[PDB]
Design a binder for these strands. Structure first.
Ligand SMILES: [Ca+2]
Ligand SMILES: [Mg+2]
Ligand SMILES: [Mg+2]
Ligand SMILES: [Mg+2]
Ligand SMILES: [Mg+2]
Ligand SMILES: [Mg+2]
Ligand SMILES: [Mg+2]
Ligand SMILES: [Mg+2]
Ligand SMILES: [Mg+2]
Ligand SMILES: [Mg+2]
Ligand SMILES: [Mg+2]
Ligand SMILES: [Mg+2]
Ligand SMILES: [Mg+2]
Ligand SMILES: [Mg+2]
Ligand SMILES: [Mg+2]
Ligand SMILES: [Mg+2]
Ligand SMILES: [Mg+2]
Ligand SMILES: [Mg+2]
Ligand SMILES: [Mg+2]
Ligand SMILES: [Mg+2]
Ligand SMILES: [Mg+2]
Ligand SMILES: [Mg+2]
Ligand SMILES: [Mg+2]
Ligand SMILES: [Mg+2]
Ligand SMILES: [Mg+2]
Ligand SMILES: [Mg+2]
Ligand SMILES: [Mg+2]
Ligand SMILES: [Mg+2]
Ligand SMILES: [Mg+2]
Ligand SMILES: [Mg+2]
Ligand SMILES: [Mg+2]
Ligand SMILES: [Mg+2]
Ligand SMILES: [Mg+2]
Ligand SMILES: [Mg+2]
Ligand SMILES: [Mg+2]
Ligand SMILES: [Mg+2]
Ligand SMILES: [Mg+2]
Ligand SMILES: [Mg+2]
Ligand SMILES: [Mg+2]
Ligand SMILES: [Mg+2]
Ligand SMILES: [Mg+2]
Ligand SMILES: [Mg+2]
Ligand SMILES: [Mg+2]
Ligand SMILES: [Mg+2]
Ligand SMILES: [Mg+2]
Ligand SMILES: [Mg+2]
Ligand SMILES: [Mg+2]
Ligand SMILES: [Mg+2]
Ligand SMILES: [Mg+2]
Ligand SMILES: [Mg+2]
Ligand SMILES: [Mg+2]
Ligand SMILES: [Mg+2]
Ligand SMILES: [Mg+2]
Ligand SMILES: [Mg+2]
Ligand SMILES: [Mg+2]
Ligand SMILES: [Mg+2]
Ligand SMILES: [Mg+2]
Ligand SMILES: [Mg+2]
Ligand SMILES: [Mg+2]
Ligand SMILES: [Mg+2]
Ligand SMILES: [Mg+2]
Ligand SMILES: [Mg+2]
Ligand SMILES: [Mg+2]
Ligand SMILES: [Mg+2]
Ligand SMILES: [Mg+2]
Ligand SMILES: [Mg+2]
Ligand SMILES: [Mg+2]
Ligand SMILES: [Mg+2]
Ligand SMILES: [Mg+2]
Ligand SMILES: [Mg+2]
Ligand SMILES: [Mg+2]
Ligand SMILES: [Mg+2]
Ligand SMILES: [Mg+2]
Ligand SMILES: [Mg+2]
Ligand SMILES: [Mg+2]
Ligand SMILES: [Mg+2]
Ligand SMILES: [Mg+2]
Ligand SMILES: [Mg+2]
Ligand SMILES: [Mg+2]
Ligand SMILES: [Mg+2]
Ligand SMILES: [Mg+2]
Ligand SMILES: [Mg+2]
Ligand SMILES: [Mg+2]
Ligand SMILES: [Mg+2]
Ligand SMILES: [Mg+2]
Ligand code: NA
Lengths: 92, 272, 46
RNA sequence: AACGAUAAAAGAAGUGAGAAUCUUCUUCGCCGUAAGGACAAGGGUUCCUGGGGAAGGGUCGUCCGCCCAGGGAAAGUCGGGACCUAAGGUGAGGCCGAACGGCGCAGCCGAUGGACAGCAGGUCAAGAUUCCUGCACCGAUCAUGUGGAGUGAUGGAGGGACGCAUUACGCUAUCCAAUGCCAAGCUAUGGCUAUGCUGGUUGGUACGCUCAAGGGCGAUCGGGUCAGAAAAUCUACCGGUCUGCCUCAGACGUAUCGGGAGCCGAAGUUGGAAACGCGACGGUGCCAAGAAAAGCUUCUAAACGUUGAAACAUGAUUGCCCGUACCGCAAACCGACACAGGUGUCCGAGUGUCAAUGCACUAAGGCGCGCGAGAGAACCCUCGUUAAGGAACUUUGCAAUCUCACCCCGUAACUUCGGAAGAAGGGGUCCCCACGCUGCGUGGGGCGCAGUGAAUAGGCCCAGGCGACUGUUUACCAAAAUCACAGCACUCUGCCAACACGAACAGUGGACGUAUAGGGUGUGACGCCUGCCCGGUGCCGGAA
RNA sequence: CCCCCGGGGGCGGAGGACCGAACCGGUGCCUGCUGAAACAGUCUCGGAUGAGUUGUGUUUAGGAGUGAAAAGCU
């Protein structure tokens, strides 16, 4: 259910500095909405969510082998928690 | 009166325009506006039918009562007499006792505040809804049914009149504006007097596209066209040879009526 | 020098689209005729 | 041959195998109602970072909008959807039709329009009414309390709801001056010692017995059934009934959060100008007579209650979907191109010049147009001046001069009494001082070949043909005497009109028009006028 | 509309009115003619509150549409 809505954490120098603000950034399945994405984050990590934002992101159009390539297509979501700002501590 | 102008532009000397001083300067009643501008620019299934209909200026429709029958026996008071860009033949707002408001065509010689009365026994005063059977012989009237209920085809435009002649079993004779004489059933309503704006005719449009403000686009002659386009096609210079319309026929003297019923109801002679 | 092709995403898909080919027989002929060519373009909808 | 606008470039320094071309510094020249900035269409990672150097780049290339990889794109309040309707498209039933199909009421879709709650700042390498900080607003659910009862519809009413030109008052944005304030330092060249120079000189919110143009509004008791389907305590009609209330644009003060030149934080004055923006739906005039629907306000119908109401106060909780990077008058859109073309809207400072988005020079900003270097032949293109002459050139004064802006004086035939007319012609134009008036005027003086000192800115007149006139045409050899045009005329057409589209006893257009109207034809403002021939053909009647 | 007796003055602000930028257009010459461009450039010129220009959305088509009319555009 909730486990496989969440995709994989963003790994970005910008996203990791936000890690220090209590802000957490990770990709999700694009067809999901904010309401379910929030209850997914907080069913999974046990923490109140007070701020969501989301954004569809096109797949880059890479080309291998001189066969023109395609997109990939994602939906990064950024989330701010309550003052109980822990996750799994797994930040680095 | 109608306005005339000094020749300060090459136009505008010949140009003329109607006098509006008798028209009350009010917004038309909101319930009767109907809107329905939506001008059908001569086009049918996208395809031109009444050729030479251009755009012109925007218009709203003023619903106008024509049958006038349903409010039989109630008095009316003439409020504003007012402009209308559809009829080009001024209309007249009026209020009924019981408060319903409906427009009516303005008779020549009718002032604001006048009484108006409708029904069968009503007296032949100006602007009443009288069925023909009670109309005095020789009176002039306008706004005339062809069949009782849903009628007002006869005499509707500026200055038009219907001069009742003799009477029969239930049919009355009348003189239409075109000079035809015609029968009409005696329970058809009429409106006493000729139409108002009695002299629309002597307005002078003045410049081209005074017509365009009226929405009538430039009207091409055949002889300027090509044999492809119209029968009066080209050939070096200018002429005739046959004298025919767009699609062919006569159009100087070629009687175009069909051979039908109700020609027996048009039984008195007709120039037309 | 205004030119013949002035792109418009609503024009391109309103005429020419998959939804519009199905509205009539003659266009559904255009579909099954191209599907038989095995094309992939099929319509303008990619 | 060309290397894609004649808007120039120079030196130093750096990086590198390699440099006219990449980076830096300092100058120079070019745009500046743009060649600066913000959006919409459209494009689709072109964006930022780190690398690269095949090909793409009109040369080179260490560079690039090229290639590789990694990141970047955040919304209850902005734009769209979960709201509404226009043309148009659909469309159960319904109307038609060899088939496929064609029409069509309600209803539905459909933004180019209506409705609707946030402003100020900060800032990633790359996002900002989105993230952050400060402080608001909007709907919904619940709770505490006041209230302690009426809510009040797929239906009615009001209202939303609308033109064009011109224009009174007040104001802000915003711009100017200064011996106002504040900050920083220096000065040389001959002088100034600051009264010089340079720079900055307030945004949002909350509260005012503060100043304030302007703008909106009449208001109830009752009668009638025949009006709004019935209802109705709401509307409409009709009759009785007596300047004042509301609103703040914006300014001012106090406070507070910001910003602020600068070396953390200074000042925030007086005088002037001023919008198409705001007050606003103002005023006036005009004819060609200027959308609809929901939201919104008001009424009952039904139903639910009338000792757990509508509504208000605080607190809490809640806030979906899509778009958002970059290009975006162009190297990223359309033109096969990194093309002298084309592309809708908004903002677009200063000085001078009646005005101005004009002209010149310039701010901020952005560029020198992706081959260079020399030579100074013929010829070719875009320009400067030209002796004496002045159209002798030539098909033609074609081309190119001339004239040119504002103020003053003065202006003909002819005329539809408006006009011809900027007729033609002649004069003024700068600087100082004094004097009068509201930058002018009167005078006196001064310099130059010359004072709209440079840039923008009519050559004129006489006489004909044609068309009256503004306007319209052959996208790409014809702009005209062609077309249309107001005005005129013939004829047709009685209303399911004539006529026209149509497979159609369908449906439409004419037209929600009705003979002072509609169709067809030909003439073509205005003035004086429009003659003879009905045998032939056409047409209207007669019909032995 | 207001004064003096159709005239003059006050005022008002009409117009297919005038000059002129944007904008729309294409007058004449030159250039360009394996173009910068499959119709343009510089100069010059016409309209510039109207029969005006323009953006979205949409309707009309092959003997057919549309056409201020060239057999022009599709
Ligand atoms: Ca000489
Ligand atoms: Mg948020
Ligand atoms: Mg007069
Ligand atoms: Mg036709
Ligand atoms: Mg005509
Ligand atoms: Mg011809
Ligand atoms: Mg023929
Ligand atoms: Mg002929
Ligand atoms: Mg010909
Ligand atoms: Mg001849
Ligand atoms: Mg025809
Ligand atoms: Mg698609
Ligand atoms: Mg595909
Ligand atoms: Mg060249
Ligand atoms: Mg250099
Ligand atoms: Mg070295
Ligand atoms: Mg090499
Ligand atoms: Mg260069
Ligand atoms: Mg460079
Ligand atoms: Mg250096
Ligand atoms: Mg720009
Ligand atoms: Mg886009
Ligand atoms: Mg995008
Ligand atoms: Mg880049
Ligand atoms: Mg870089
Ligand atoms: Mg790079
Ligand atoms: Mg290379
Ligand atoms: Mg390679
Ligand atoms: Mg190369
Ligand atoms: Mg979003
Ligand atoms: Mg917020
Ligand atoms: Mg919205
Ligand atoms: Mg709808
Ligand atoms: Mg419909
Ligand atoms: Mg249909
Ligand atoms: Mg819209
Ligand atoms: Mg809003
Ligand atoms: Mg930074
Ligand atoms: Mg950026
Ligand atoms: Mg911001
Ligand atoms: Mg003002
Ligand atoms: Mg000074
Ligand atoms: Mg200063
Ligand atoms: Mg009530
Ligand atoms: Mg102050
Ligand atoms: Mg509705
Ligand atoms: Mg942006
Ligand atoms: Mg270009
Ligand atoms: Mg343009
Ligand atoms: Mg300006
Ligand atoms: Mg300026
Ligand atoms: Mg100026
Ligand atoms: Mg300029
Ligand atoms: Mg640029
Ligand atoms: Mg030379
Ligand atoms: Mg030259
Ligand atoms: Mg000399
Ligand atoms: Mg001479
Ligand atoms: Mg000779
Ligand atoms: Mg000669
Ligand atoms: Mg000649
Ligand atoms: Mg010449
Ligand atoms: Mg005379
Ligand atoms: Mg005179
Ligand atoms: Mg002349
Ligand atoms: Mg001298
Ligand atoms: Mg002199
Ligand atoms: Mg000069
Ligand atoms: Mg001759
Ligand atoms: Mg002419
Ligand atoms: Mg041509
Ligand atoms: Mg064309
Ligand atoms: Mg030409
Ligand atoms: Mg029928
Ligand atoms: Mg009909
Ligand atoms: Mg003629
Ligand atoms: Mg004759
Ligand atoms: Mg005056
Ligand atoms: Mg004009
Ligand atoms: Mg003149
Ligand atoms: Mg042009
Ligand atoms: Mg043209
Ligand atoms: Mg001229
Ligand atoms: Mg003119
Ligand atoms: Mg034919
Ligand atoms: Na010094």
């Amino acid at each position: 259910s909730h486990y496989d809505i969440l995709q994989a954490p963003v790994i970005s120098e910008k996203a990791y500095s936000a890690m220090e603000r209590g802000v957490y950034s990770f990709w999700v399945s694009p067809k999901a909405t904010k309401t379910e994405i929030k209850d997914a984050i907080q069913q999974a990590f046990g923490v109140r969510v007070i701020g969501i934002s989301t954004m569809n992101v096109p797949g880059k159009r890479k080309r291998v082998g001189r066969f023109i390539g395609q997109r990939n297509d994602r939906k990064k979501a950024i989330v701010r928690l309550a003052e109980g700002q822990s996750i799994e501590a797994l930040a680095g | 009166a109608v306005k005339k102008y000094r020749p300060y532009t090459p136009s505008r000397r010949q140009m003329t325009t109607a006098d509006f001083s008798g028209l009350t300067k009010k917004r038309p009643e909101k319930a009767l506006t109907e809107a329905l501008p939506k001008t059908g620019g001569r086009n049918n299934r996208g395809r031109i039918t009444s050729r030479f209909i251009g755009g012109g200026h925007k218009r709203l429709y003023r619903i106008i009562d024509f049958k006038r029958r349903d409010k039989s026996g109630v008095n009316a008071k003439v409020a504003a007499i007012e402009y209308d860009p559809n009829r080009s033949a001024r209309i007249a707002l009026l209020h009924y006792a019981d408060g319903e408001k409906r427009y009516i065509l303005a008779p020549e010689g009718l002032t604001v505040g006048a009484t108006v009365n409708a029904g069968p026994e009503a007296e032949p005063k100006l602007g009443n809804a009288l069925p023909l059977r009670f109309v005095p012989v020789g009176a002039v009237v306008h706004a005339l049914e062809l069949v009782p209920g849903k009628g007002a085809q006869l005499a509707r435009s500026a200055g038009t009149s219907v001069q009742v002649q003799g009477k029969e079993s239930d049919y009355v004779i009348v003189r239409l504006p075109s000079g035809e004489l015609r029968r009409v059933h005696s329970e058809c309503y009429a409106t006493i007097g000729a139409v108002g704006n009695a002299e629309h005719k002597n307005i002078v449009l003045g410049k081209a596209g005074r017509s365009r403000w009226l929405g009538r686009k430039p009207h091409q002659r055949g002889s300027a066209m090509n044999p492809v386009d119209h029968p009066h096609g080209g050939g070096e210079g200018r002429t005739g040879a046959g004298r025919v319309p767009v699609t062919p026929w006569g159009k100087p003297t070629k009687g175009l009526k069909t051979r039908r019923k109700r020609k027996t109801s048009d039984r008195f002679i007709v120039t037309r | 020098m205004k030119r013949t092709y002035q792109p418009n995403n609503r024009k391109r898909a309103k005429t020419h689209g998959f939804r519009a080919r199905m509205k009539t027989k003659s266009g559904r002929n255009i579909l099954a005729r191209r599907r038989a060519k095995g094309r992939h373009q099929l319509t303008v909808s990619d």
